[PDB]
Amino acid sequence: MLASVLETYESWNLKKPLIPQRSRLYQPQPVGIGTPYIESLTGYITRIAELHGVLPGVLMTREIAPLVNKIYFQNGANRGFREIFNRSQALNGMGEMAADLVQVLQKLTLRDDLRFLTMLFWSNILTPRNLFRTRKAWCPICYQERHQNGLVVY
Amino acid sequence: STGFPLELLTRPATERLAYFENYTVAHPRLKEVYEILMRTIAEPAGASFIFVYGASGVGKTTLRLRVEQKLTELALPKLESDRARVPVVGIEAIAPESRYFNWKEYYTRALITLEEPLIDHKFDYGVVAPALRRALENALIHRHPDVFFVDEAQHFGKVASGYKLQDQLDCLKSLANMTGILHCLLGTYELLTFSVDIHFRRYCADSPEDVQAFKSVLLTFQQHLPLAETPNLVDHWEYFYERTLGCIGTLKDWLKRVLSDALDREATTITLKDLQKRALSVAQCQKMFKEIQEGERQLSET
């Protein structure tokens, strides 16, 4: 029944630190970097929409259209952006729409290698005449092999 | 220093209240549980549930805040390049208005706290709220939180069914299995109604070491109280244990009440009647002790 020591103690200073601002959307690494089998920007938009559980059109209309500063982008976010889907071949192209989509996706995702997914590197050497399809072309064997092996489909 | 700054006396009373309200004493139980939780988080040993107990007033929420801040600052060097990497997500369970816990609301609040866009526009790609469930699963996989804190986890048991009490947790079990996200369910002793178990034990009077720890935290509380004259409090340790049962959390808010009353009267010290004015009710402590005794008996199995 002796006397103990009345220690004191210390505080914890519960203050959360400051972190860099997070990307609005996710940051999936593009498939095919450094490989002749690189993924397209439109495919990247579709994949990032699938990861978010929303349809790609909804994602573009409600999150990509407002960020752009063009009249037909803001006015097209309340009507159905059929302009960007009927002319989606230029999203992976060497033009201004491709550059603007790359920049807005970079701002949304905080990535630095999105311009490789397009042909902006070949803007001054390649012409847009007969270069891009109007229709989607896919290899069904590629989809089946990617899904069976457990890899992501792109 | 170990004492409160002497320059706050000339400062307004609101500044003294703000200073004392933010002081979080590191009693041995708090730091011991913090070390155990950090060890479990660093190496999970394949577990996916970090159930933590403790009667109201032990300090679970502040422990959660401390762990959140520590994990955020630990990850801080590596979020400069890696984005969409929120370190830790901490949410609070909703008490259902109906008889059964709502899982759609849980999913939507978990999505909101993750800043996930377009929650109203979710889609199900082939159960309660399959679209929201898949969205939360994907958000946990990609954002990759270290831990997923769920405070007030005792509200998960609001099902009123013995054959459904354990099955109510299947949603969280499957969400933790397929996303690999540690779920640390902080709750009171009701959570024992059902995996790593941690006990946030109070300072029971039977063990003299707990009495010594309670007197230590009481003294370090009295040292940081911003008054002109330091109020003697260790003498009525018996009183401070009767209305507190040994919880360092409700002791803090009791002292906050008394200090605010003293500051509003431009007083200089604390007497017994000041503590009696803002003390817990006689019946309140009895109910609290009954609940904590039930929890301790439930956890007493060896």
Next chain:
Amino acid sequence: STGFPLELLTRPATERLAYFENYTVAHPRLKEVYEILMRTIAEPAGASFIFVYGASGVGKTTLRLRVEQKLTELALPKLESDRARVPVVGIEAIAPESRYFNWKEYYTRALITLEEPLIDHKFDYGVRGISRDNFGKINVESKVVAPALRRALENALIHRHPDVFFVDEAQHFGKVASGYKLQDQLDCLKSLANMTGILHCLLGTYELLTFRNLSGQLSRRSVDIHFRRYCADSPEDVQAFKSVLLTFQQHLPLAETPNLVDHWEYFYERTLGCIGTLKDWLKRVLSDALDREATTITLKDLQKRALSVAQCQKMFKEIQEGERQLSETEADVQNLRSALGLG
């Protein structure tokens, strides 16, 4: 003088009745409960519930109105300086037409009361349905589901951050059917007060005592105040009741003041010591006297507008069944001390 103004005698009876009905007397119980409630509201210290118990007619609603007015006047310079701020918000719980309490109605009426008496300060609650209108009145669709309303209420309360949320006649929270528990109906309010950090003060009669101590958490994050009536065994409250009767008598707008102190046994018998009930009784007798253009108050006048014995007996039964349960003694402390081994 401390009595009623003399020119009121020449004024019409309506002015005298209005003056008496607008007159609020200060008595020790009301002052003590007001001070305790104010000091608890000014600093909650993690408390999520204030339980202001009291009988029927002790002055639980006038106390709430006085506290609300004082808080609003205290914060008025701050309201002028900073917008999007409400000092105090207060609603009354509704007895349900069905057998269970309606939480959706509680949420929608709390949202209406919180937001409607505000200028069009554009705020976006995180729910699709609820929004403001051209006239400024808030609107909630019948399609809106109750947890969404609860989320909107949390966001609104966080933005406005009132000092206290008053819920008068909170004893109606206990109107639960089937096999529900009165615990399960307090965590919902507890959770709402916890995530928002809003001090929810519940005022009710002695039938609110079923919410007193349900769980350790609900009993730790809650404080209680007793609006005790005036008893008869103690000389002190008898003298205080006599003083209140004298104060009422001096402020009765009549030609010749009646001697109400002599009939103190009769006044206490039909009022049980509650000051409010005595106020309504005296107001009834005064209006009858003014309707007869009388100059005095007789015993028959009080007996005409008195309360029947059965009503007072039910009153007194419930009052004992509440005070005996709310009573604390040295045994309730000694057994608690012996439970911990502290004795």
